[PDB]
Design a binder for these strands. Structure first.
Ligand SMILES: [Mg+2]
Ligand SMILES: [Zn+2]
Length: 516
RNA sequence: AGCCCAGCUUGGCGGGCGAAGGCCAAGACGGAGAUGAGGUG
DNA sequence: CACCTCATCTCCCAAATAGAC
DNA sequence: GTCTATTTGG
């Protein structure tokens, strides 16, 4: 029954962030910073105590940290504008973070908390309390205007998924445009709600249970984006029992048709969508194939890098012009202080010059126009420099997920390697350009998406020990030495004595080992 | 040529260059947080 | 000191209390 | 007296 899921809805791009939401984000950021400082003080005090059996001392110091955490609830929630759901969310995140840090230190790997700086991105939360002996928080309950959670979270127009899938995409997209009234904390003791105009693509099972929701705001290229994520407790799915066995193995051999990333071998024929056959290649028999990634991903990422370099060039030229003009002319006051050539010359970030241009948008001086001459163009190309990158990465991710789906649609047993990921990606990945491909390939992402699909769809997953498999030749079964002979493919064997493919032999070994 | 125009990816139609304006088709979809690395200024 | 990539691991609460009607 | 929003210890 316990299968948590998250459904996300995208707020309309024509929704300026209201002041209430901005203040909630600011308060959450301040709370996290204060918790970080308190934890750092606690860590230093524990170090000092150890620098002096002391468990009572440690226990006493820990309790004082607990009191300050409670006193933060008094400062931010009891006498502030923060919502008690946001505070609980941030406190839980901080507690989990410090627990993970302690676990890491126990092994011997050092770690520490790092401050951050507010930029406008953040998170607000809402928790749907369900006491014992209460009806479930089904989507029909949240869609009701006079329901229990009408002032906490209201998601109108829920249409049954069985009926939802029958509607055409036009009807599904036009009817999915709804408004969600979300509780947004307090304001001088005056509770505030926000009407998010959202677009919904999928709905929830009628038997779900909405545990909570959260609104996430992120700044991409200077433009705010908001997304509402709703968490529900879907009932579990019966695990599959019948289906072909598929073994998946990672690779990174460069190919003329893109970056080849994976090799899969199935014990029975698999059917692949015709929209993936250029990505998920399949041999004649349908039992083995290669997953390659297109070349457009690489071209787009290279174009983004070129854009970043051109931006650097333009910024350096503008810096030189600004320093020259400032030296040759007077300095109008900015930030209540005269402008100095030294400060401008040492500037690196485009943000400083963008802010200066905004301040001097209409100073009337010549350089102001020059400054605007840059600030316009920079704000365009910057968008490109990031947006295309995201799109490119998005494309790759989509492909991976699609591929994962097809496996869970047919496979009855999926096998994955274990030690052929980290160490192999560290050593045989083939340096700055060499390591660039692996970031663009990101085979670990494909592995993770496949694993997630198999877990969600009930497919059993078996992890095969890749130890002493790379050097193994399937046709002969002899361990060839590690003489970097595998820098290419195929590689001559030291057993039978013939060039054998390093990927097909590996996956056939995997299939043999699983069914033994 | 890019990026943007009711979630995301891919396409088609019609538009915008910081402002506009959306319409359709196919597919997939578990998010947040922190830490650790790799790099880049 | 600031930015980006990628890799791992957690987690997803509800009982008690006081109020507006 | 009944749903409801807030505080708080796991
Ligand atoms: Mg869009
Ligand atoms: Zn051999």
């Amino acid at each position: 029954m316990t299968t948590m899921t998250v459904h996300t809805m995208g707020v309309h791009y024509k929704w300026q962030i209201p002041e209430v939401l901005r203040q909630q984000l600011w308060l959450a950021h301040n709370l996290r910073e204060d918790l970080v400082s308190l934890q750092l003080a606690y860590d230093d005090d524990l170090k000092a105590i150890w620098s002096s059996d002391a468990a009572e001392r440690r226990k006493a110091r820990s309790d004082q940290l607990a009191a300050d955490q409670k006193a933060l609830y008094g400062q931010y929630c009891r006498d502030g504008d923060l919502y008690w759901a946001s505070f609980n969310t941030v406190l839980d995140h901080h507690k989990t973070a410090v627990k993970r840090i302690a676990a890491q230190r126990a092994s011997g790997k050092p770690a520490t908390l790092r401050h951050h700086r507010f930029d406008g991105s953040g998170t607000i939360a809402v928790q749907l309390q369900r006491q014992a002996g209460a009806p479930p928080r089904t989507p029909m309950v949240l869609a009701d205007e006079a329901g229990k959670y009408r002032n906490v979270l209201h998601i109108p127009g829920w249409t049954d998924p069985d009926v939802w899938e029958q509607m055409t995409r036009s009807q599904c997209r036009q009817s999915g445009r709804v408004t969600v009234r979300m509780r947004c904390g307090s304001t001088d003791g005056q509770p505030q709600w926000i009407d998010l105009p959202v677009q919904v693509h999928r709905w929830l099972p009628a038997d779900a249970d909405i545990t909570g929701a959260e609104l996430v705001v992120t700044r991409v290229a200077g433009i705010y984006r908001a997304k509402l994520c709703v968490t529900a407790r879907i009932g579990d799915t019966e695990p599959v029992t019948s289906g072909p066995t598929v073994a998946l193995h990672l690779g990174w051999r460069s190919t003329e048709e893109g970056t080849a990333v994976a090799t899969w071998r199935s014990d029975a024929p698999l059917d692949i969508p015709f929209g993936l056959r250029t990505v998920m290649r399949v041999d004649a028999a349908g039992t083995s194939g290669i997953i390659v990634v297109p070349a457009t991903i690489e071209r787009r990422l290279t174009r983004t890098e070129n854009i970043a370099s051109s931006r650097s060039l333009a910024l350096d030229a503008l810096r030189d012009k600004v320093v020259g003009w400032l030296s040759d002319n007077d300095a109008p006051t900015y930030r209540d202080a005269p402008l100095e050539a030294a400060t401008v010359k040492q500037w690196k970030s485009p943000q400083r010059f963008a802010s200066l241009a905004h301040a001097w948008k209409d100073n009337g001086t010549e350089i102001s126009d020059i400054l605007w001459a840059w600030f316009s163009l920079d704000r365009k190309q910057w968008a490109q420099q990031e947006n295309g990158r995201r799109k490119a990465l998005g494309h790759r991710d989509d492909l991976y997920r699609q591929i994962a789906a097809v496996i869970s649609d047919q496979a009855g047993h999926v096998l994955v390697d274990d030690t052929s990921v980290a160490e192999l990606s560290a050593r045989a990945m083939e340096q700055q350009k060499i390591d660039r491909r692996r970031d663009h390939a990101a085979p670990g992402g494909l592995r993770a998406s496949v694993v997630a699909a198999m877990t969600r769809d009930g497919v059993p997953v078996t992890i095969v020990a890749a130890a002493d498999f790379t050097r193994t030749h399937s046709r002969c079964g002899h361990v060839n030495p590690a003489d970097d002979r595998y820098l290419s493919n195929p590689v001559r064997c030291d057993g039978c004595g013939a060039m054998y493919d390093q990927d097909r032999s590996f996956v056939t070994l995997m299939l043999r080992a699983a069914t033994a």
